[PDB]
Design a protein around this ligand. Structure first.
Ligand SMILES: Nc1ncnc2c1ncn2[C@@H]1O[C@H](COP(=O)(O)OP(=O)(O)O)[C@@H](O)[C@H]1O
Ligand code: BEF
Ligand SMILES: [Mg+2]
Ligand SMILES: [Zn+2]
Lengths: 343, 364, 369, 249
RNA sequence: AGUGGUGUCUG
DNA sequence: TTTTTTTCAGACACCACTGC
């Protein structure tokens, strides 16, 4: 199939419409805008009737097959849509997706929306049979190092003037929150029809919504950015994240750091990285962290992490978020006191 | 004020025009611009904090939508239809307590009411308070209606915890986030309310009430009515302060402040207060431990203060900047030891008192 | 005074309350929409039941002393009291304060009521179509199209039924996106042309109000509401907005081939083919040749039925794919012995109608073959 | 399978007889009560009579029917599930019913098939002491006449605890009900009676079930005072008795 | 109303 | 490239499908 970013989708849609469109990724906003563009282009070429379905173990597949095979009294040119579940094309769903891949026709246009597909796990069969004459659209959230240029492009295409300061403020409050970021730009356009956004204008009309995953917290710890890591920790506290997930995500990299710092006396860090199968972008930040106050924080932090783990897993009142703040501050070149470490 | 003062300040004082709303200027300005320019989204999700006006803003927006003078940011005065929202009932404006009617059947009836024409107003406006409580199937039905809503239907959703709303609902709703009111705004609105109620008030009592409100204007209004209750139709500073102290539960922070300052009589007075309130003592020790731990983390890095403790920011700063880390370490160790030995004491009260006595006796 | 002096037998009150109850009984949107509205006026009792969209009113004659009062009382409790009291018991209900007293021979009840000023009433509207019609004609008009209505479709206009007043005839139209049912009958009177979309609930209640006697069913339609008078029962229902799909366009424009057969044989053949039709991808295939009609379906079992010699045909050999539900419902609604279908093309839709009775016409959009 | 070679009691009983015997007592059982001995029906055998007793500590129901065959006195508690499913399978009154009760399990041969169940270990209470021992007030009424009046009163009854006050005066009976909404229902009925004015407040569902169990035309109620129980039965027989212990509200 | 499932939150 | 969670016990809340 044609693998495509949202940038050229319009162009591809102007070239022609394929049998099936697969909108995949973890970003609600990018998927939604891609689906809207696809539906508008389809309606331009006569696809008037729409449908929606949620791919679920309790869905009625017979209705989908009936509407795909049969035609309607009006608006014969029809389109169909399916929301894939959180996990993806379950093993009980691949066969019926294959049937749909057989039950299609040039009259119908299929839209597939859901999270990213683990291609290493799921491939061929359904995937290749669509790949015959289909389009894959990858709509994933831009990361922190990439978000500012995305926001600049969005401001340019919405006819706004964003300076670097407003851009970084917007990139600060809204991460993993591209939907609310676009809504914030829309609200700022509504607030001032001038279209010129400065620092105070965006600063006043913005909330610290954000959305982080424990990987962001662990990366912030490895870079040793105190404010960034603490902001991430507060955000996962407010979001309601399970602290034990944070514990495991930090523990994996912390034990890797302990192993690397212990073995670095006999082997350069490059061969250790190769031994443990760690990737290059990970390699850079882990090399930055390994020579940043090591051999003391790597056992003191393991001690504090064990304290948090046992306290979390014995009682039911939790109250481990402050201890996680202690960890966030220990691994960022801000030494703590033995009083809180030992307990 | 009213015909015998039974009518509550909270409900009697509710905005009827956009200008009577206290400074939630963001949503008001954006909505006024959208209404005047004709740029209308299908749904207008409102959110924020309790008692900061999201239901008031939604009601005023419904009034502006269905007013016969046209889509205006300023609903007029008489406009019988535009009046029916406040006094009596309006046919086309449906107000649903989504907390009372969470079921997919109760919302099914109204989503089947969607396709019928509005009686008088232009828009079949829906005001769904506490929208986060609809079940999964109620949310599915609401989303299905939000995909292709008719041009005569608008949805107004208000909630306090939007995180429970699905992303599918949030993508179709232009969420307007309301920020917790400042102490100045709350104090000014309370001043205006009391001045127009012909209620004798002292300036300091208003600031005390605003600080005690925790950013919610309705909290300030309820505390104000209660303060008038504690007295005879006058909001006196002494009565308000006594009422606030009676309602006060911030014992651990005051205990840490007085223990670090080495103020034995104040510490014992605060322990007496915590005893008279029937406050758990192990919980008191845990709160003091958490406060000391947070003070230390702030001393390490100013970013350790999250948005969960915006009420007690300044004091924390004052304690973190002025107290060396050695003293905080010693006090944390002392209170940890005391909480460890709390069960084996004459009673919890004496155990907490003795732990605080040790912490004072350290004098480091 | 406060007492809405009221006195009637049970025999003349059980059926009117049973009619007025309607949708009441469950959880209402507003707490008052579970209470029947009782009104006394000019020697008549008015029973009213409202759902904020439907309005059922019953009139009962008063031949005993009465007082002009009105109040709303819980529907289920009042009905349970009314039927609980013995046969021929002269109910005497009066009012005082906020409680109304029900009385019978050697029995008393007290019920909590709400004011009549708060109970909703559907606003008066101007009517453009004043229409009167016999009972059986309306019964057939509804029954011949109710099957083809949408089932909670996302398209509002698909739900409900279309009423068209054209010249001397009234027409009922129903569509679900794949079927079309049209029933047009003369009414003996001239009316202005008008088009109205009636919701599913209104159609169901219209079918419900039908009596086995001879009473002129009076239909009065405005721009946003429909009203039906049947004896002393009055029904008001608001309408569904939008545009109904123009049934004239979906009607096969220029048919050229046609099959003629009977209702019972086709019914049996399609019922037999249904068993060999999978629920997944439900449908049938019709092989049509000269005086030949073979009905099969898609199924892994790969079965077949053949009754080709029971049909008359004069066109070319070709195939059209219907669905089990569509054809079964259409033939069931076509009770006449003879039946015929207009095959135009495999892509185009097919008309089912009687050999000489074209008033009830159905249009089925086939599959893609 | 059948290791219960010896049985304590044996019955060759008509199906209709036990159908009435259970139907006249089933509604008074206890469902998932903490008193495990009350979560069942007591079959009691004495002389030629078999009795079913069911109580939940708020109502007692006893029903006795002759058999003709002399049997030793015995007591057994059949749990709720066993007796309910035996009642369900007890159809086709033409075929007789065989009953085989041992010390630990019960068997019922219905038609051609066999049913097996276990027993409740506890010992059922003595119902003779629950029955009032000095009924000084006796009143009579019509079963349907009384029942319809109770139903009409129960229409406006407290939905949580369906309770009515029954007053007895000279040749007159009064049933008064109210709900938390103060909706008052009052029914007055003509009875034959001789005694003193007395009020007693008891549940409505229990009395209605008692009346439905007695498919008769004349009903006799026996009462002692406002605080003790009421013994309801029919006036055409003494084979079925019911004890309703009132509320103190 | 009985039964079974999903899911979320409290220690 | 992906990479993400202990537990036993209990309390609600909603939504089939049944059964009258
Ligand atoms: N912006 C505001 N202006 C004036 N009063 C307010 C405002 N916000 C809250 N209130 C007061 O609080 C009371 C309840 O407000 P409400 O808007 O219902 O809060 P919520 O957002 O939690 O639904 C109102 O009657 C009003 O007195
Ligand atoms: F009405 Be609010 F959300 F407290
Ligand atoms: Mg609210
Ligand atoms: Zn107005």
């Amino acid at each position: 199939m044609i693998r495509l970013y949202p940038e050229q989708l319009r162009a591809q849609l102007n070239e022609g419409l394929r049998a099936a469109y697969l909108l995949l990724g973890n970003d609600p906003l990018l998927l939604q805008e891609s689906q809207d563009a696809v539906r508008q282009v389809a309606a331009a070429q006569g696809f008037e009737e729409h449908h929606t379905f949620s791919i679920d173990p309790n869905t009625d597949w017979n209705a989908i097959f009936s509407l795909c095979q049969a035609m309607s009294l009006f608006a014969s040119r029809q389109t169909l849509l399916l929301l894939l579940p959180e996990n993806g094309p379950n093993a009980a769903i691949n066969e019926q997706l294959l049937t749909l891949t057989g039950l299609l026709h040039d009259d119908l246009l299929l839209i597939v929306r859901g999270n990213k597909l683990s291609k290493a796990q799921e491939n061929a069969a359904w995937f290749t049979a669509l790949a015959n004459r289909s389009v894959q659209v990858t709509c994933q959230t831009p990361e922190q190092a990439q978000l500012p240029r995305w926001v600049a492009a969005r401001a340019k295409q919405l006819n706004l003037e964003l300076d670097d300061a407003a851009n970084q403020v917007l990139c600060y409050c809204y991460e993993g929150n591209l939907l609310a970021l676009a809504q914030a730009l829309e609200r700022l356009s509504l607030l001032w029809p001038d279209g010129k956004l400065t620092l105070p204008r965006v600063e006043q009309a913005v909330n610290d919504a954000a959305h982080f995953t424990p990987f962001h917290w662990v990366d912030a710890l490895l870079m040793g950015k105190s404010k960034r890591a603490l902001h991430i920790l507060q955000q996962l506290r407010l979001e309601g994240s399970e602290p034990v997930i944070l514990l495991r995500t930090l523990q994996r990299e912390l034990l890797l750091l302990v192993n690397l710092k212990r073995q670095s006396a006999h082997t350069p860090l490059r061969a250790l990285f190769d031994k443990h199968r760690v990737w290059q972008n990970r390699r850079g930040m882990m090399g930055e962290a390994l020579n940043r106050l090591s051999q003391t924080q790597l056992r003191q932090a393991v001690q504090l992490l064990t304290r948090t783990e046992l306290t979390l897993k014995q009682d039911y009142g939790q109250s481990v978020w402050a201890e996680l703040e202690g960890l966030s501050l220990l691994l960022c070149h801000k030494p703590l006191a033995d009083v809180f470490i030992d307990g | 004020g009213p015909h015998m003062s039974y009518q509550v300040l909270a409900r009697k004082w509710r905005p009827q025009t956009f200008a009577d709303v206290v400074g939630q200027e963001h949503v008001l300005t954006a909505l006024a611009n959208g209404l005047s320019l004709g740029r209308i989204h299908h749904a207008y999700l409102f959110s924020g904090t309790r008692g900061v006006g999201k239901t008031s803003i939604a009601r005023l927006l419904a009034k502006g939508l269905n007013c016969e003078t046209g889509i205006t940011a300023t609903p007029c005065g008489v406009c019988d239809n535009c009046r029916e929202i406040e006094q009596g009932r309006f046919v086309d404006l449906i107000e649903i307590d989504a907390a009372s009617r969470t079921k997919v059947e109760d919302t099914r009836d109204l989503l089947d009411n969607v396709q019928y024409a509005p009686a008088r107003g232009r828009f079949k406006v829906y005001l769904i308070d506490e929208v986060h409580m609809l079940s999964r199937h109620s949310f599915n039905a609401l989303l299905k209606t939000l995909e292709e809503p008719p041009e005569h239907v608008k949805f107004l959703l208000a909630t306090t915890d939007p995180q429970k709303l699905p992303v599918t609902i949030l993508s179709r709703c232009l969420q307007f986030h309301l920020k917790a009111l400042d102490v100045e705004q709350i104090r000014h609105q309370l001043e205006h309310i009391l001045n127009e109620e012909h209620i004798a008030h002292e300036p300091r009592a208003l600031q005390l009430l605003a600080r005690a409100a925790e950013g919610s204007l309705r909290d300030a209004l309820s505390l104000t009515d209660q303060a008038i209750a504690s007295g005879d139709g006058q909001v006196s500073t002494q009565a308000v302060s006594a009422m606030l102290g009676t309602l006060d539960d911030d014992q651990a922070l005051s205990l840490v402040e007085a223990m670090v300052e080495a103020n034995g009589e104040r510490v014992m007075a605060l322990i007496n207060e915590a005893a008279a309130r029937g406050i758990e003592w192990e919980a008191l020790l845990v709160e003091m431990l958490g406060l000391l731990h947070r003070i230390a983390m702030v001393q390490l890095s100013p970013a350790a203060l999250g948005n969960d403790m915006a009420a007690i920011e300044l004091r924390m700063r004052e304690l973190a900047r002025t107290i060396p880390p050695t003293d905080i370490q010693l006090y944390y160790q002392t209170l940890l030891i005391g909480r460890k030995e709390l069960p084996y004491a004459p009673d919890r009260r004496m155990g907490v008192e003795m732990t605080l006595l040790r912490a004072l006796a350290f004098h480091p | 005074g406060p007492h809405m002096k009221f006195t009637v037998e049970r025999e003349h009150l059980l059926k009117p309350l049973q009619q007025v109850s309607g949708p009441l009984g469950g959880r209402p949107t507003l707490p008052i929409l579970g209470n029947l509205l009782l009104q006394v006026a000019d020697g008549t009792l008015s029973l009213t039941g409202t759902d904020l969209e439907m309005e059922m009113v019953a009139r009962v004659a008063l031949v005993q002393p009465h007082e002009p009062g009105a109040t709303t009382v819980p529907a289920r409790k009042f009905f349970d009291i009314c039927r609980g009291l013995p046969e021929g018991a002269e109910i005497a209900v009066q009012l005082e304060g906020e409680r109304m007293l029900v009385r019978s021979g050697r029995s008393r009840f007290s019920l909590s009521t709400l004011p009549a000023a708060d109970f909703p009433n559907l606003d008066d509207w101007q009517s453009e179509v004043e229409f009167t019609l016999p009972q059986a004609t309306m019964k057939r008009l509804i029954e011949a199209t109710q099957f083809s209505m949408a089932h909670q479709d996302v398209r509002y206009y698909l739900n409900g039924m279309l009423f068209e007043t054209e010249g001397e005839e009234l027409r009922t139209v129903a569509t679900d996106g794949h079927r079309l049912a049209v029933c047009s009958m003369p009414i003996g009177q001239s009316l202005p042309s008008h088009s109205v979309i009636v919701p599913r609930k209104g159609v169901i209640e219209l079918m419900r109000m039908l009596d086995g006697g001879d009473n002129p069913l009076r239909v009065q339609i405005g721009s946003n509401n429909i009203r039906a008078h049947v004896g002393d029962f009055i029904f008001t229902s608001k309408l569904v907005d939008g545009r109904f799909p123009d049934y004239r366009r979906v009607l096969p424009k220029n048919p050229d081939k046609h099959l003629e057969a009977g209702c019972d044989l086709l019914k049996q053949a399609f019922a037999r083919a249904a068993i060999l039709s999978n629920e997944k991808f439900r449908g049938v295939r019709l092989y049509v040749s000269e005086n030949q009609l073979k009905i099969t379906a898609n199924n892994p079992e790969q079965e077949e039925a053949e009754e080709i010699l029971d049909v008359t045909y004069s066109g070319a050999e070709m195939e059209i794919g219907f669905n089990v539900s569509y054809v079964l419902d259409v033939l069931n609604a076509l009770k006449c012995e003879n039946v015929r279908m207009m095959l135009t093309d495999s892509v185009s839709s097919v008309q089912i109608e009687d050999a000489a009775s074209q008033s009830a016409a159905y249009v089925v959009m086939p599959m893609r073959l």
